[PDB]
Write a protein that binds this ligand. Structure first.
Ligand SMILES: *Cc1cc2c(cc1C)nc1c(=O)[nH]c(=O)nc-1n2C[C@H](O)[C@H](O)[C@H](O)COP(=O)(O)OP(=O)(O)OC[C@H]1O[C@@H](n2cnc3c(N)ncnc32)[C@H](O)[C@@H]1O
Ligand SMILES: *Cc1cc2c(cc1C)nc1c(=O)[nH]c(=O)nc-1n2C[C@H](O)[C@H](O)[C@H](O)COP(=O)(O)OP(=O)(O)OC[C@H]1O[C@@H](n2cnc3c(N)ncnc32)[C@H](O)[C@@H]1O
Ligand SMILES: C/C=C/c1ccc(O)c(OC)c1
Ligand SMILES: C/C=C/c1ccc(O)c(OC)c1
Lengths: 550, 550
């Protein structure tokens, strides 16, 4: 194909066409598309940000490429080093609220790694791990487990929806809700194609499986792994794995992910907190429970509007066009039999141990006036408890997609600061966050997810993507919040394409020492800067900061 | 001082003298010793390898310099850049079995970080963590906690001995014996001086503490951390932390380490396993109880000679010169009331819970005939269990020094391959290692430490450091085990200075892509190659592989 809307920087139409004809010859026409449509979550777009906060076409591919296998990735890396051509690797491209598939730089090729590199490569019972290509969704892996009857042996750890990529998510350092919620920390042994195009496996992936007749003459990409590659992450030497999470340092083609053995018993629960202000005492309670390990998983603390938005759009609760007031949340709370904040967790292992922990947690929270406790069977058919009862046991679902439609053309954008597990800091962050959403004319929606010594506060900004005036207020809210939170001692853990530079500028301890360091590494491994220029605000030297930063 | 024993490569005598005059000016001559004696554990040497497998003077410092503070480190670095002068940074230098404080390159300035940089900087209760400098030993910190009554709120995690640096050991990715035994995984918020001299803090350490009047004009080194620094490791962007463990990528000045809250219940224990072959079913039994958190910590499986050696030297058990027979090891077993393998664990938390766990473990191991369960109270006063009682609850001891003296001028050398948590794998690693130990005329001594999905297998080579015939046999032993283990798909997790090259050459999947990618990052951040050249087999470009490898 001949003519795209946007060319990559410094690249001619004639060069671009040579590149494309070249790539077609490798991967076939059926695996290439040049852009000369926001799609669905069920069928994600690969061309741009479906939940756009800037103009729809602001972050736009010049084309999409789908390698057939790892060899293609290498060949494609080669040509991009030849032509000086920016690549943007996605696994699945369901990173909505962070930009979806869209490339940080327009004119890039989007590498749809997921379409053909699909395979669940291994599920090892005794080692309680699995090995995975970019294309394996949470649901995909769920179904492989069923086919081979492994459901009674091994559980998954799923984020709030079923379609993201196990690896996609893991390298974004994302989060789920079993004791295996720290997704990044569950990996051992990743294979990566570098900016030079050479293959590398990490940790004990670097210790090769010894030779035997069955595996002779296998291309490296197809060689098995030695027996410890997915068991012991460190390997030997400097431990580089993390240089591949949230980086543009390489293109991940495989990853091993630890899986929880069937725990021996499971019980989910809801605790409902009546007052807006109860968040303070509730978090002080969480602290030692989590830290002392009566809280086995990553339990979340949901604001009322999050459950309500699952349950029906805003028109369903009021024809109001302004944020719902403090007192309507009370009415909605009491309609839905929920509190102002709603705490979800679960209990794992034998009855005798579940009993003890539950009595501890039950006891601890009873200090909060008006508290009420529910198992799944005590709630209506449509409840968030029922849905989450699935989630905290590794079953992929999709019911939580509905909150996206809180407003007539609902898109989400995530503001994701980190809080202490302390009522006081939490209230402050809430206050700082709630205040601004207001000035923006938006309902406040958000969770806190509970890590051991921190909470991921996911403020869920939902907007009508066809509304230009609102879009701008969303750009104002985000940028303002980033600042407010930095001035209060809080950083964000993950974000959107349009906020990456701003966010990094925030991690400026000692004259931006962190980003400088990262650039030195980026330019050495990426001398042509072809991988994902601009991810996390890291720019190769051929990318002027003045031209390229937002 | 004027004339040193060995000079760093490519550097004149005239230059060394101008250099050390510049350092003497900064650190004062009290913090400089030019070398022109082995010591012990309590007074550890800073010049060479106290447990030398090569000639005593093979790895040898040219001087030892003791920075008073972070600013002295920046100047020394600046000067080491001026003169191309290798630095070898240590914290305490108790890396016995791995080369102690010896530099990999003879001629280097051993950088004694711990002499003056000494402070327990922070102990935060609600976050349950500490911030520490290199000079703080495990005993140092223990006494800090006792002296503030903190031992009732927070416990430590300690290796077998208490002399090691909390930070130094963690950057070596070392292991301890509570649920906090994965020392490295417990870090958060590292401060690092780079090869160019510049300070950097990782993770949310890069998110600045907001401005206030109390902290104005503080040197970057002396600034506080933002509230989340030591709560959330990741921060934002590429997670570069691990580039600083087992690496030569920088000089660490400060680290945050997570501390486990008093669990509200503790009980250690021993299980004795009569036969040599009982290892196989033991491991097979441990596997599901590890994955399922009936075993909450890092338990150990000790060879009978490990315990035997703590209680008495070889000369006391047999007069024989060769290795001990099988029957002579059942004799020592029945003598000491231990099995051939001895499993040391510990239960944590409230009694209602400790109880259930224990009944599962007891009942799990009962399928092994002649098994015996002991609490500390059930054993002789000198027993290893009584020592590990303290160990598996964060109390330092020094009792385990006694096994080093299993031979006249006993020295240890660790061979530390990683095994699967499977009897088959473990027996195999045992057989492989026992065979070669015979050939070399050594007794086999070691422990397995049970990580979640891996075991660290510490083959404890003790040898007579004044016997040149045996030191050569130990060299042969080491180099053969490395090769054999490799040929059976196992790699070492850490090693001695003389085996760094070989071991790293072992992880050569896809023609040493791992090393090549490591080399690339090193030359980027260390142009003149001054920080610890040769650490983990990673050499900067101006060190010829031909000249430097062993
Ligand atoms: C809409 C929304 C999103 C959401 C959520 C709830 C709603 C309603 N709940 C989440 C949750 O609880 N936890 C969480 O971590 N995220 C949640 N999200 C966000 C999103 O839906 C998921 O996180 C989703 O899994 C992420 O998208 P996906 O997994 O498909 O990843 P991707 O689109 O391919 O992009 C990942 C980014 O990471 C880097 N990347 C990905 N693959 C590679 C490879 N192959 N090599 C190198 N880098 C890779 C890229 O930077 C890419 O941009
Ligand atoms: C003799 C022995 C040793 C031993 C053991 C039992 C016996 C009887 N059991 C151990 C165990 O249970 N777990 C464990 O991790 N180690 C065990 N050992 C080995 C050793 O004694 C300890 O590991 C000890 O704590 C290590 O030594 P130390 O703590 O003093 O650390 P160091 O010598 O200063 O440094 C070791 C290496 O780390 C790098 N390093 C240290 N500081 C820095 C700084 N700040 N910057 C950059 N790198 C640093 C260096 O590479 C140094 O060589
Ligand atoms: C709502 C849930 C959610 C959304 C986006 C994220 O990044 C996330 O991480 C914990 C959680
Ligand atoms: C004997 C104890 C020991 C020695 C060296 C090590 O590296 C280690 O880590 C598991 C343990």
């Amino acid at each position: 194909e001949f003519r795209p809307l946007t060319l990559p920087p410094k690249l001619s139409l004639s060069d671009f066409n040579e590149f494309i004809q070249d790539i077609i010859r490798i991967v076939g026409s059926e695996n290439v598309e040049v852009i000369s449509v926001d799609g669905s979550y069920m069928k994600p777009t690969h061309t741009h940000d479906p939940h756009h906060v800037m103009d729809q076409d602001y972050f736009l591919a010049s084309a999409i490429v789908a390698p057939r296998n790892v060899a293609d990735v290498q060949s494609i890396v080669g040509l991009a080093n030849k032509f000086s051509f920016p690549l943007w690797p996605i696994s699945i491209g369901r990173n909505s609220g962070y930009g979806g598939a869209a490339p940080r730089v327009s004119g890039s090729v989007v590498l749809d790694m997921g379409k053909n590199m699909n395979r669940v490569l291994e599920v090892n019972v005794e080692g309680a791990y699995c090995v995975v290509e970019p294309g394996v969704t949470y649901h995909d892996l769920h179904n492989y487990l069923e086919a081979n009857n492994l459901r009674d042996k091994l559980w998954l750890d799923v984020p709030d929806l079923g379609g993201g990529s196990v690896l996609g998510n893991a390298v974004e350092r994302g989060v789920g809700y079993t004791p295996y919620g720290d997704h990044w920390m569950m990996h051992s042994g990743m294979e990566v194609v570098l900016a030079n195009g050479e293959l590398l496996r990490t940790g004990m992936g670097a210790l090769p499986d010894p030779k035997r007749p069955e595996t002779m003459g296998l291309k490296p990409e197809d060689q098995p792994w030695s027996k410890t590659a997915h068991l012991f992450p460190y390997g030997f030497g400097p431990y580089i794995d993390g240089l591949f999470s949230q980086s543009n340092m390489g293109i991940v083609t495989k990853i091993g992910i630890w899986l929880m053995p069937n725990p021996r018993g499971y019980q989910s629960y809801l605790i409902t907190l009546p007052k807006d202000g109860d968040l303070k005492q509730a978090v002080d309670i969480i602290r030692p429970l989590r830290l002392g390990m009566a809280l086995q998983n990553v339990p979340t603390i949901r604001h009322i509007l999050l459950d309500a938005a699952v349950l029906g759009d805003k028109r369903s609760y009021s024809s109001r066009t302004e944020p719902l007031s403090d007192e309507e949340l009370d009415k909605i709370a009491k309609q839905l039999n929920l509190g102002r904040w709603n705490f979800y967790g679960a209990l794992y292992g034998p009855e005798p141990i579940r009993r003890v922990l539950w009595e501890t947690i039950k006891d601890a929270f009873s200090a909060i006036p008006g508290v009420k406790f529910y198992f799944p069977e005590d709630t209506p058919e449509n409840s968030v408890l029922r849905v989450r009862d699935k989630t905290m046991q590794g079953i992929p679902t999709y019911d939580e997609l509905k909150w996206i439609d809180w407003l007539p053309n609902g898109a989400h954008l995530f503001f994701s600061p980190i809080a202490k597990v302390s009522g006081e800091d939490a209230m402050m962050q809430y206050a700082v966050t709630k205040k601004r959403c207001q000035e923006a004319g938006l309902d406040f929606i958000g969770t806190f997810t509970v890590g051991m010594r921190e909470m991921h506060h996911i403020v869920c900004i939902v907007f009508n993507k066809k509304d230009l005036i609102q879009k701008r207020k969303v750009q104002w809210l985000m940028r303002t919040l980033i600042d407010d939170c930095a001035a209060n001692g809080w950083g964000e853990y993950r974000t959107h394409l349009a906020f990456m530079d701003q966010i990094m500028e925030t991690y400026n301890w000692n004259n931006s020492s962190f980003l400088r360091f990262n650039e030195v590494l980026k330019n050495a491994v990426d001398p042509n800067g072809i991988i994902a220029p601009g991810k996390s605000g890291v720019w190769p030297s051929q990318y002027s900061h003045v031209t390229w930063k937002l």
